[PDB]
Design a binder for this molecule. Structure first.
Ligand code: CL
Ligand code: NA
Length: 129
């Protein structure tokens, strides 16, 4: 599923991401934009053999099991494939664990490089929330 900007913002809000650990909704939407282009089926392989999955590109070395990343942990306790679904529930639940992991949203390289220190509120302007 490829989400619309406002549609994703609403789903993210319903799942309790607005101001989660102090990050307003704008940050989450911006991160999803630049990580996956709002596409739940996005996958990208990394040089270390791990793969990033779904709307927020969650990584197979620490957070999910894809059965091909040796010495991986499975901290969100899910198959990585569940992160590709049109239902973003598992992605949001796992991202909450990630963002609580001490480094906040800096775990997402696209957020740090392209959202952090910008006007993230612009990513939900216009939306009915
Ligand atoms: Cl933080
Ligand atoms: Na893993």
């Amino acid at each position: 599923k490829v989400f619309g900007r406002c549609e994703l913002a609403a789903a993210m809000k319903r799942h309790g991401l607005d101001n989660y650990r102090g990050y307003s909704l704008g940050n989450w939407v911006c991160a999803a934009k630049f990580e996956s282009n709002f596409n739940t089926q996005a996958t990208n392989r990394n040089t270390d053999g791990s793969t990033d999955y779904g709307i927020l590109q969650i990584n197979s070395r620490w957070w999910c099991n894809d059965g091909r990343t040796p010495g991986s942990r499975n901290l969100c306790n899910i198959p990585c494939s569940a992160l590709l679904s049109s239902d973003i529930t598992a992605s949001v639940n796992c991202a909450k664990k990630i963002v609580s992991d001490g480094n906040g949203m800096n775990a997402w390289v696209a957020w740090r490089n392209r959202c952090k220190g910008t006007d993230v509120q612009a990513w939900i302007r216009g939306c009915r929330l």
